[PDB]
């Protein structure tokens, strides 16, 4: 290829979209933005399959372009907007406020929320750097560059964001007494407690996460996503409560 | 055009390389522009990704800096007296990085070695030995 | 590969084309079941051979192996609804002791016989192929319907 690609073959699509192998030749390529290609669910797949509002792509463009979807506080009108992690999705017409969390089946799930709890959304800091003119800033897992932050908001914490205001409500550190949700590989979509983080200077940082039922499973530091403090969850966990049945 | 791939070179064992594909623009090279001494003339080359390189063809002046006195002053270059790489650069007075050039200290009132890339940045900037 | 829809073979031919000891044994069942040709015998033989291979592979592992408990019950469960294996035999060893009469005796042409609708097993085909028979709520005309235990008392005209 001489440049960036535009089509996406059905079989090259991420497995966790559950697209029928005989559905069609191509799959909806998610446009760029906040969430990566394999970390996001395109907005078309959320409505055609998860919610079954629209049977085909004819009736998906008739909705998203109709200003009838509010991804986070703002409103998006892109048919293939990348809808990723717990970034809230709201439909004022039907009066429902979903949210895209993971679950134990390595799948994005639409956890229903109330109106009040949909006004906020948790973000995970990715990095903190000093800007020119000594203007420090932090980058969340949504690609957001938040302005002048708290001095203690370090690289791998978790912050609380407000849709209406945009400020930072509460912030959770990264320690051995916090509840974390998993966004990774085998441990994907599992809730647990950080108990041990063994450090290897060379390549990766390995974190041992103890489940509620005493199950212990390790992972890479990248996949860890702190969800609360002191065995408390800041959001309504999915139906299976982040528990895995052997 | 000039190419910068390694597909035209011999292996570490001396064995010849057998070609598979034709030339490509990624490994594109370009002709040198030996910035001689003369009147001001630069050209804007449209490089990859649209970025613009100032290609100094001939220059006369440069913003020389003095480390000891913490002063940088413009000056007119006189003559290229030494090049560490090619002595033929001295004869043609070609201006490249590291060329030892003598200059008149008229604003210094208040010997040089170039420390910039005239063929890339588009101007001569140096310091005083 | 070229096509996306999967395909499979339902039977295999015998390795030795010409045996008298096999022509009589296979013709014993053809009369006993009114089958159209020798493909039906091979298909039933092919079906059994798959289950026997699962039990055969699984008997080589420990009883506390996670795969033995899960897959082992799955095969016994599947057989139980089909009714090939008697319920009181609930071990993987009894799978290997299955024969080719167990599978053929649960076919629709066999079931309508012993229940009494069809006088002769050749007469059962016409009734079955004529859609005269019904299984619960759906008309059936494939004489190869492997009825389950639940659908055993739900076979009427």
């Amino acid at each position: 290829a001489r440049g960036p690609r535009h089509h996406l073959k059905r079989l090259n699509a991420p497995h966790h979209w559950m697209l029928s192998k005989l559905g069609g030749t191509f799959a909806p390529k998610p446009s760029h933005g906040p969430h990566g290609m394999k970390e996001c669910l395109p907005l078309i797949l959320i409505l055609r399959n998860r919610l079954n509002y629209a049977l085909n792509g004819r009736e998906v463009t008739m909705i998203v372009k109709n200003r009838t979807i509010k991804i986070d506080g703002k409103i998006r009108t892109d048919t293939r907007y990348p809808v990723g992690f717990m970034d809230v999705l709201s439909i004022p017409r039907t009066k429902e406020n979903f949210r895209l969390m993971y679950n134990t089946k390595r799948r994005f799930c639409l956890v229903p929320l109330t109106a009040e709890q949909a006004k906020f959304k948790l973000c995970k800091i990715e990095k903190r750097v000093l800007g020119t003119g000594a203007i420090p800033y932090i980058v969340t897992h949504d690609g957001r560059t938040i302005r002048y932050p708290h001095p203690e908001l370090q690289a791998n914490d978790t912050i609380k964001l407000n849709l209406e205001t945009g400020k930072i409500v509460d912030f959770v550190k990264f320690d051995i007494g916090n509840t974390a949700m998993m966004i990774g590989g085998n441990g994907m979509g599992r809730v647990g407690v950080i108990v041990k983080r063994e450090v290897h200077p060379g390549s990766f940082e390995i974190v041992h996460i103890k489940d509620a039922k005493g199950n212990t499973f390790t992972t890479r530091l990248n996949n860890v996503f702190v969800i609360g403090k002191g065995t408390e969850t800041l959001v309504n966990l999915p139906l299976d409560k982040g528990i895995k049945k052997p | 055009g000039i190419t910068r791939d390694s597909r035209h070179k011999r292996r570490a064992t001396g064995g010849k390389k057998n070609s598979m594909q034709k030339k490509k623009k990624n490994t594109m090279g370009r002709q040198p522009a030996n910035t001689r001494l003369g009147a001001i003339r630069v050209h804007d080359v449209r490089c990859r990704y649209g970025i613009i390189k100032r290609r100094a063809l001939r220059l006369e002046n440069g913003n020389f800096s003095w480390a000891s006195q913490s002063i940088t002053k413009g000056t007119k270059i006189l003559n290229v007296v030494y090049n560490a790489s090619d002595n033929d650069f001295v004869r043609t007075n070609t201006l490249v990085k590291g060329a030892i050039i003598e200059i008149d200290p008229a604003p210094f009132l208040w010997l040089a070695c170039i420390s910039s890339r005239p063929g890339q940045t588009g101007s001569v900037e140096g310091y005083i030995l | 590969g070229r096509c996306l829809r999967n395909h499979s073979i339902t039977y295999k031919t015998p390795k030795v084309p010409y045996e008298r000891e096999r022509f009589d044994a296979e013709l014993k069942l053809v009369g006993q079941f009114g089958l159209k040709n020798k493909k039906e015998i091979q298909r039933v033989h092919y079906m059994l051979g798959h289950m026997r291979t699962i039990a055969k592979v699984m008997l080589m592992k420990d009883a506390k192996d996670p795969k033995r408990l899960l897959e082992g019950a799955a095969l016994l469960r599947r057989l139980h609804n089909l009714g090939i294996l008697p319920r009181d035999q609930n071990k993987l060893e009894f799978v290997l002791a299955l024969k080719e009469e167990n599978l053929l005796e649960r076919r629709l042409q066999t079931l309508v016989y012993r229940k009494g609708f069809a006088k002769s097993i050749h007469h059962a085909r016409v009734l079955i192929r004529g859609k005269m028979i019904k299984v619960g709520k759906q008309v059936v005309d494939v004489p190869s319907f492997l009825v389950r235990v639940e659908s055993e008392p739900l076979i009427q005209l």
């Binding site: 079954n52 085909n56 439909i91 | - | -």
Partner: protein
């Protein structure tokens, strides 16, 4: 009949009509062997403007 989905955005209702033998959409019907029962999807657009605009 069967499952009914209320669609306000498309101003329609998605219901799977089961047949046990200008504002509506009748499509996607497949019977059983030899006739008898037939299933299908029923779409109702209430307003005629919907059928006037919400049709491919």
């Amino acid at each position: 009949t069967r499952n009914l989905i209320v669609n306000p955005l498309l101003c329609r209702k998605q219901v799977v009509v089961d047949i046990y033998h200008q504002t509506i959409v009748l499509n996607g019907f497949v019977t059983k062997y030899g006739g008898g029962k037939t299933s299908g999807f029923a779409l109702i657009y209430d307003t005629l403007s919907a059928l006037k605009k919400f049709v491919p």
